[PDB]
């Protein structure tokens with residue numbers, strides 16, 4: 001579809017069996033999800049945002065459905081105010097910016 | 100243009116008569132640039148993102164050229180890790196997300 005930017009570009013995603021709302025963020029290099037108890041092994045990581053760094057948990061090869069489009073990749077889980085779908089996954093669903 | 104997301108969506112902007120590089124950020128509500136001098140009065144403001152809040156200077160109705168397209172709106176200046184073009188200006192140049 002085509003998403004305008006008058007408001008935050010929020011979409012429905014499916015991960016670990018749960019449906020959530022996530023922001024399509026072209027400015028984010030990685031995908032960061034709100035704290036959730038995902039199964040599997042993970043490794044610690046520090047990611048930097050506008051006002052500093054936060055500590056997150058990195059999970060690899062996690063299947064995720066974005067607005068009906070299947071994708072699979074790395075997901076970082078930590079104390080984020082909102083779920084963020086970054087470029088690592090946006091490229092997978094063939095998302096582009098146009099003007 | 101149509102921009103893919105395999106690489107950071109960076110573009111050249113012209114502001115205050117100077118050239119700079121900036122990130123097209125659909126996850127950013129406002130536009131924030133690195134510390135620099137801008138003509139006109141400014142008001143102190145606080146914006147929050149991942150990592151926390153930072154103090155910035157708000158300049159209103161500032162003309163800015165983004166990749167050849169003209170826009171005139173609010174521009175925040177402060178200790179941001181990188182130059183970001185948010186939705187307030189992206190909407191002015193008719194930017195949309197597509198997939």
Ligand SMILES: C[C@H](c1ccccc1)[C@H](C[C@H](O)CN1CCN(Cc2ccc3c(c2)OCO3)C[C@H]1C(=O)NC(C)(C)C)C(=O)N[C@H]1c2ccccc2C[C@H]1O
Nearest residue numbers: 027028029030048049050126127128129131146148149180
């Ligand atoms: C989700 C987040 C959000 C928080 C709270 C409410 C809504 C969205 C967005 C994110 C922003 O799109 C992308 N942002 C641009 C600057 N660079 C910087 C960067 C680059 C390189 C780095 C680094 C940090 O650290 C080490 O290397 C960080 C990047 C970011 O936060 N990335 C991760 C992977 C951690 C998610 C964000 O910060 N948004 C705010 C925002 C932004 C600008 C102006 C106004 C406002 C208000 C908000 O909308």
